[PDB]
Design a protein around this ligand. Structure first.
Ligand SMILES: NC(=O)c1ccc[n+]([C@@H]2O[C@H](COP(=O)([O-])OP(=O)(O)OC[C@H]3O[C@@H](n4cnc5c(N)ncnc54)[C@H](OP(=O)(O)O)[C@@H]3O)[C@@H](O)[C@H]2O)c1
Ligand SMILES: NC(=O)c1ccc[n+]([C@@H]2O[C@H](COP(=O)([O-])OP(=O)(O)OC[C@H]3O[C@@H](n4cnc5c(N)ncnc54)[C@H](OP(=O)(O)O)[C@@H]3O)[C@@H](O)[C@H]2O)c1
Ligand SMILES: NC(=O)c1ccc[n+]([C@@H]2O[C@H](COP(=O)([O-])OP(=O)(O)OC[C@H]3O[C@@H](n4cnc5c(N)ncnc54)[C@H](OP(=O)(O)O)[C@@H]3O)[C@@H](O)[C@H]2O)c1
Ligand SMILES: NC(=O)c1ccc[n+]([C@@H]2O[C@H](COP(=O)([O-])OP(=O)(O)OC[C@H]3O[C@@H](n4cnc5c(N)ncnc54)[C@H](OP(=O)(O)O)[C@@H]3O)[C@@H](O)[C@H]2O)c1
Lengths: 280, 284, 282, 288
């Protein structure tokens, strides 16, 4: 059959829970940006598999509503804590409350981000600093505080930062996000090294476009990704099955990065008969 | 310092995927008779895959294939193959298609290695390694991919490289070279062969447990405070080859307890500095 | 001869100007951190080669001294402008003055930085933010503003960021620095792509230690780098000879990174005799 | 326009950059030294006073090139016929280089082969051919010279010319991508392993250099994927090469330098296809 048909058949999304039912029982997970999109799906999955989840972002209204919706769908309590990650104090309070309404985290997911798609020359210094403050410093502040607390309590945890495929390569039009996300990856590798003795491991997922256009033409897998597929990868990495996975960076992109980065991949349209002529 | 690594980095050596999730699937694994290849085969079979293993020592292949087959109640076929021979490779692919069917899961795991100063290697010692690792994976990939294209079928491919494939390393230079080539190939065919329903991923393992003072000094360079286990690696591989990972393609996953990040970080040697010593320096 | 002497003989530094005399004439160069160390060195050589340099940093005291010290050495004028790169207002005024006293820059070197060596546990959120600010945001503010000006003027420039080898790998004990430096690298790569249409190119050097014994055991070249060596590479990259080099990341480390990052490089101390033995067991 | 902005500011400086006679008394061994990039690198190193030795399969092209450069520079260029994928020829070639010129201070592994083809249409022999020339060839050359340098207690600067797709991989050039990546790994490995012997190892990753396209339009489309707005030149590359092999770079070791006009960063950045968007089009998306 055709490209699109092989792509649909052989890269069909398995959108159901992967890990053993109740595998996260007695584990507490903390998800920045847990109220929407990717953060939500990851919460929904960790909750649905038995974790006690704490979610944190700016908008309490959406945060409470998401927690409620998941809590009633899974049976397990999702707690909402209002937090702007770029504020150290709100972060300290959020860690303080996290440790009261659940206990010390076993799973830390840094997923809260901001982004502007714009020509860089149209960005103001403030627009730049904002993205940097949310992505880079916000992840640092959350990691710093939780880290400091886990050391004091002699507990360990699995940390997971969600970045993006352009974190590695750079990209025009998303410059402060590329820079801050690169910062986030370097931080993960830095702390995977530093904090092993404390029982803390640090991994990264770099997603391509998740369905939550014809970017599909740049994806070998011929479709956008799904939230549930991603959550599955996140759950695996934060699971005990992955206790030896540390300092890793996993592309979740249907092959988008390797495709666009390959010099001669712009030949993928070239037809069979054109190929016969080219070899002449 | 080690009881934190004992409890919080404790290995989970049981099967993670759901029972019979690999029913109806066929797995082909080079080096499937020993170490990691065996552990991977063991897991896939216990999850209901019809496994086919391939390497040179047929006696080990059959023993292993029989041992797993009796423990899981699913058939493990053995095929003798030197991966660096295209003709033997052709046969093997053919025999696999006849006795099991087109593979849904292809795992290149067969390797060879010298640990030696590079100046002590002959040209042939160098060429041998390149042959088994690079050309061998390529030959397996080429033929299988040609059959899958003809049959209008697709598969998940997986290559086991190493943490030094990305960095290079003295003393294992031909292996580093060939393995880097393998990673490049995977990323290349993730891009080229997506259209045929083929995806390609890579695991980079650190030291997996396969006077005893060398093991101790190695662990000193591992943040996770221990070597990996075959079972843990097997779960990562199954995941990567499972339908749960059908949007994972061109990925390169370090499975190393954090070794690469530790040794590569310029100031990581400062992990020896003591808490009281830091007080002296923080005053300066 | 032994290792140390082979290393001495074949890796000897060439600490003199490399490019043709007066090859940077008619060029203006802006260097942050250009008052001390690596930035000074790069300023000296560009000045010695005919560029009109403008250096910018916090401390006016050390800046003016340096800018005088170099101007007396080379003859060419080196201007100093007091600037904190984490302050976008001061950056805006600094760029404005740069253009008024020298003109639009042809070379832009983002070199100002700050660092702590510390267990990450002992960092306050404020200590972290400070490194992030000077390094990532500062470089972005300087780049943003000059870029905006160069686009307005329809002129182009070579940009150069000095990062470090751990920007790519991460590293414990220098964590905010690694994160910000990494951010600086992604930025260069992003802008090389975005701003090619405006005639701006973006490159990066990652230095290892530049002029202790512990490292030299981890440096295959067997010595620290020198400021004049690094300056030559900077000058090259900022010259018209490198007009087709864009988005590049050059390690200048005597091999330190490849040494430490290689799993089996810890076997470097294994002796010929032990090597004879090790092969007998395999 | 944009091309007038790029033409003015990324303008190629196609002339020697290193000081006259800076390579005097240095011997350089360049594989593929008779043609394309190898020729340009040979020409320049000779022009700067190096005793160059070039090597490749075709003695005729080799001799012609060697003579042509020797007459241009008054400096001696010797040809030695060599198939790099043949270990015994490599042995004899190195032995010949030592006798006719001396131990090399500069070694440039430039010889290559490539096929542009769908992978499915390659035979195992087509695949293996490329691996042999690019990976095994560079290795045999490096192995033998390095053995000789260690014996003699001399060091040298090694340079390997790869490609931007060696790090990323790329469809349609898969054997090359694989073999080139192996070459990069080798350079990094030997920078660590052989620094103690006075050997350093670096890599250039070139994008498209000026010398399939009957109309001229494919080259035109290629330029669109290049931030710098042109292809590179041999002379430019040769200058980067000479720099990396000069004593000025005696502290550069294990480096990998893209020379590509910014192509690799442009094609690899997820959102870079947004460069097509006009100013007005942006004036709507930001108004949302
Ligand atoms: N979806 C994709 O295709 C895609 C692609 C690549 C990468 N990603 C990555 O995936 C992650 C999740 O993104 P998404 O698509 O689900 O939605 P998103 O647009 O990134 O939403 C951001 C989330 O972070 C929270 N947030 C924003 N600012 C915050 C702050 N200052 N403090 C605390 N929380 C804050 C938001 O909640 P509040 O508004 O309540 O604060 C929101 O839930 C991000 O890291 C993103 O970079 C997504
Ligand atoms: N174990 C570790 O700590 C570790 C560390 C880093 C990387 N790895 C990687 O993990 C993979 C598995 O290796 P291992 O550790 O299980 O032990 P190993 O000794 O490397 O396994 C080699 C396997 O490959 C097969 N093989 C060798 N040459 C072959 C040839 N020419 N044709 C076909 N098959 C061939 C062998 O079977 P026959 O002898 O019967 O032919 C054997 O099963 C390797 O790719 C290795 O690079 C492992
Ligand atoms: N030296 C090495 O061995 C080495 C190794 C690896 C990387 N590097 C990199 O090389 C570069 C050069 O550093 P260096 O060794 O010469 O000294 P450094 O201490 O790393 O750089 C400090 C310089 O930057 C200026 N600076 C600091 N904060 C500033 C601010 N907020 N605004 C404006 N300027 C500021 C300082 O001047 P003021 O005090 O007046 O502000 C000083 O001139 C740095 O980017 C560093 O990251 C150096
Ligand atoms: N030109 C570009 O735009 C570009 C772009 C990316 C990368 N590169 C790289 O730059 C380098 C030079 O390339 P090029 O374009 O000048 O020509 P090329 O086609 O890449 O290389 C051909 C050269 O290699 C020699 N050679 C081929 N097979 C050989 C063998 N079996 N043993 C010894 N020598 C052999 C040839 O000499 P004989 O025919 O006499 O044997 C010829 O001089 C190559 O490594 C290439 O991969 C070039």
């Amino acid at each position: 059959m055709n490209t699109e048909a092989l792509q649909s058949k052989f890269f069909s999304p398995l959108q159901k829970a992967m890990l053993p039912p109740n595998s996260f029982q007695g584990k507490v997970a903390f998800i920045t940006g847990g109220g929407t999109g990717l953060g939500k799906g990851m919460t929904t999955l960790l909750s649905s598999l038995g974790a006690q989840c704490v979610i944190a972002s700016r908008k309490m209204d959406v945060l409470k509503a998401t927690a409620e919706q998941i809590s009633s769908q899974t049976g397990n309590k999702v707690h909402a804590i209002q937090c702007d990650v770029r504020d150290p104090d709100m972060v300290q309070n959020t860690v303080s409350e996290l440790i009261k309404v659940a206990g010390h985290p076993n799973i830390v997911i840094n997923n809260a981000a901001g982004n502007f798609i714009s020509p860089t020359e149209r960005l103001s210094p403030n627009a730049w600093k904002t993205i940097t403050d949310i992505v880079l410093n916000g992840t640092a502040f959350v990691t710093l505080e939780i880290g400091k607390q886990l050391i004091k309590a002699q507990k360990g945890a699995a940390f997971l930062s969600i970045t993006t495929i352009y974190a590695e390569t750079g990209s025009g039009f998303v410059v402060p996000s590329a820079s801050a996300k690169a910062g986030v990856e370097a931080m993960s590798k830095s702390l995977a090294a530093e904090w092993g003795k404390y029982g803390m491991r640090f991994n990264v997922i770099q997603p391509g476009p998740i369905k939550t256009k014809e970017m599909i033409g740049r994806i070998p897998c011929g479709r956008l990704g799904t939230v549930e597929e991603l959550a599955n990868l996140a759950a695996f990495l934060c699971s005990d099955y992955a206790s030896w996975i540390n300092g890793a960076v996993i592309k979740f992109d249907g092959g988008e990065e390797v495709l666009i980065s390959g010099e001669f991949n712009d030949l993928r349209k070239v037809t069979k008969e054109q190929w016969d002529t080219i070899e002449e």
